[PDB]
């Protein structure tokens, strides 16, 4: 399969990227170096992941090594919730740029639709454990994102964890200058996202699927939770194709015209997850995988559920 998808900013985005949430800082530099060596050209980052400096060391070394050219990389990061303020967005982007050793990002996302009170804490809480909101809305945050394009800091802007009505708000913004290029959302066989995907695709927004393996390392995992990688129905499809279950789980979103960003810090798995361009799931395989939907989310957070803009129900 073709390795890149065309965005509505005219640029092409690699459909397979390396995720970096939870990648330890002492491991992620090697992970990214290995990823680039074995063919990855897209890295998904975020300031809140607390490892962009170390990701950046890897990127810079591979650029300095001339393993790749900067134009061939597609580096994504995300504006954290405590920086949804006019006067904070540029500096947040610039900190990410400085950490990543870059002079531009290929794509910068509003990480979650919810703004939180600015300050040192990423999740400022009241004394009863509720997140403390910001008054700033997604439209004003979007205007701030548009300025970053116009200043040359980012080539594309987009959104993440926006629900249907929030995407629509963005698209219906008075005076909208740049449409979102991407909506990055959780998506896998247990949370198949057909409705939100069709809406976004119908509007020309590319969807990136996060947690495609079900985020087995999520810190709130419980032993009784469903496990994609261990689901014998998925293992059976993998066996039929002489591929791993992870490879099926990665190929699945690719054939839905999604971008997908599996995370690993294990060199062998980083390579395994890239070897997904030489096999095809049938339509029956695809529909069978879709049938496993159970509306199950890795990423949700009780402390944020009363925020006016919390996306999920």
Ligand X SMILES: NC(=O)C1=CN([C@@H]2O[C@H](COP(=O)(O)OP(=O)(O)OC[C@H]3O[C@@H](n4cnc5c(N)ncnc54)[C@H](OP(=O)(O)O)[C@@H]3O)[C@@H](O)[C@H]2O)C=CC1
Residue 214 interacts with which of ligand X, ligand LDT, none, CB < 5 to 8 Å by class: ligand X
The site that binds ligand LDT (CB under 6 A) totals a number of residues, namely 11
The answer to whether 184 contacts ligand LDT (rule: CB under 6 A) is no
Calculate the alpha carbon distances from 239 to 219, 264, 268, 278 in Å.
Answer: 29, 22, 19, 15
CB 263 within 8 A of CB 23: yes
Contacts for 126 with CB less than 8 Å, ≥ 6 apart: 132
The answer to whether 211 contacts ligand X (rule: CB under 6 A) is yes
Calculate the alpha carbon distances from 240 to 267, 269, 285 in Å.
Answer: 25, 20, 10
Catalytic residue annotation: 49
Residue among 179 and 263 whose Cβ is closer to ligand X: 263
Q: Which two tokens stand for residue 192?
A: 């198949």
Residue 211 interacts with which of ligand LDT, ligand X, none, CB < 5 to 8 Å by class: ligand X
**Contact pattern from residue 1 through residue 30 relative to ligand LDT, giving x for each residue in contact according to CB under 6 A and a dash for the rest:** --------------------x---------
In angstroms, how far is CA 109 from the centroid of its own chain? Answer: 9
The answer to whether 143 contacts ligand LDT (rule: CB under 6 A) is no
In angstroms, how far is CA 171 from the centroid of its own chain? Answer: 20
* Of 38, 143, 169, 299, the one binding ligand LDT by CB under 6 A: 299
Residue among 20 and 29 whose Cβ is closer to ligand X: 20
Calculate the alpha carbon distances from 37 to 53, 250, 270 in Å.
Answer: 19, 19, 10
Window 245 to 284, contacts with ligand X (CB under 6 A): 246, 261-266, 269, 272-273
CB of 144 to ligand LDT, least distance (A): 18
Distance (Å, whole) CA 54 – CA 32 = 9
CB of 228 to ligand X, least distance (A): 8
Residue 265 interacts with which of ligand X, ligand LDT, none, CB < 5 to 8 Å by class: ligand X
Choose one: 43-51, 137-145, 187-195, 221-229; the region binding ligand LDT (CB under 6 A). 43-51
CB of 48 to ligand LDT, least distance (A): 4
Calculate the alpha carbon distances from 179 to 10, 123, 139, 173, 174 in Å.
Answer: 12, 28, 12, 10, 12
Output the residue with the shortest Cβ distance to ligand LDT: 301
- DSSP conformation letters of 223-280: TTS--STT-HHHHHHHHHTT--HHHHHHHHHHTTT-EE--B---HHHHHHHH--SS--
Element spanning 4, H or E: strand 4-6
**Which residues sit in the known binding site for substrate?**
111
Residue 192 interacts with which of ligand X, ligand LDT, none, CB < 5 to 8 Å by class: none
Q: Cα Rg for the chain, rounded, in angstroms? A: 19
The answer to whether 51 contacts ligand X (rule: CB under 6 A) is no
CB of 46 to ligand LDT, least distance (A): 6
The answer to whether 189 contacts ligand X (rule: CB under 6 A) is no
Contacts for 188 with CB less than 8 Å, ≥ 6 apart: 209, 211, 212, 213, 214, 228, 249, 252, 253
Q: CA neighbours within 13 Å on the CB side: how many for 20?
A: 33
**Chain positions contacting ligand X, by CB under 6 A:** 19-22, 44, 111, 160-161, 184, 210-217, 229, 244, 246, 261-266, 269, 272-273, 298-299
**Chain positions contacting ligand LDT, by CB under 6 A:** 21, 46, 48-49, 112, 114, 299-301, 304, 310
């Amino acid at each position: 399969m073709a390795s890149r998808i065309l965005l509505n900013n005219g640029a092409k985005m690699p459909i397979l990227g390396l995720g970096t949430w939870k990648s330890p800082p002492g491991q992620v530099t090697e992970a990214v170096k290995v990823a680039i060596d074995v063919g990855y050209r897209h890295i998904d980052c975020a300031h809140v992941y607390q490892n962009e400096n170390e990701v950046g060391v890897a990127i810079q070394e591979k650029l300095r090594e001339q393993v790749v050219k900067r134009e061939e990389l597609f580096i994504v990061s995300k504006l954290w919730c405590t920086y949804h303020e006019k006067g904070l967005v540029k500096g947040a982007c610039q900190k990410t740029l400085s950490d990543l050793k870059l002079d531009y990002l290929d794509l910068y996302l509003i990480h979650w639709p919810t703004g939180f009170k600015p300050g040192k804490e990423f999740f400022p809480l009241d004394e009863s454990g509720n997140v403390v909101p910001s008054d700033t809305n997604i439209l004003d945050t979007w205007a701030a994102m548009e300025e970053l394009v116009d200043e040359g800091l980012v080539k594309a802007i987009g959104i993440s964890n926006f629900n249907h009505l929030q995407v629509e708000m963005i698209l219906n913004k008075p005076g909208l200058k740049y449409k979102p290029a991407v909506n990055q959302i959780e998506c896998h066989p247990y949370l198949t996202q057909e409705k939100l995907i069709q809406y976004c695709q119908s509007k020309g927004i590319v969807v990136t699927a996060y947690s495609p393996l079900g985020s087995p390392d999520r810190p709130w995992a419980k032993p009784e939770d469903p496990s994609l990688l261990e689901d014998p129905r998925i293992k059976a499809i993998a066996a039929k194709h002489n591929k791993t279950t992870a490879q099926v789980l990665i190929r699945f979103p690719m054939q839905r015209n999604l971008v997908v960003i599996p995370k690993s810090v294990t060199p062998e798995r980083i390579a395994e997850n890239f070897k997904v361009f030489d096999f095809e799931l049938s339509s029956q395989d695809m529909t069978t995988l879709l049938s496993y939907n159970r509306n199950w989310r890795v990423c949700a957070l009780l402390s944020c559920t009363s925020h006016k803009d919390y996306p999920f129900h």
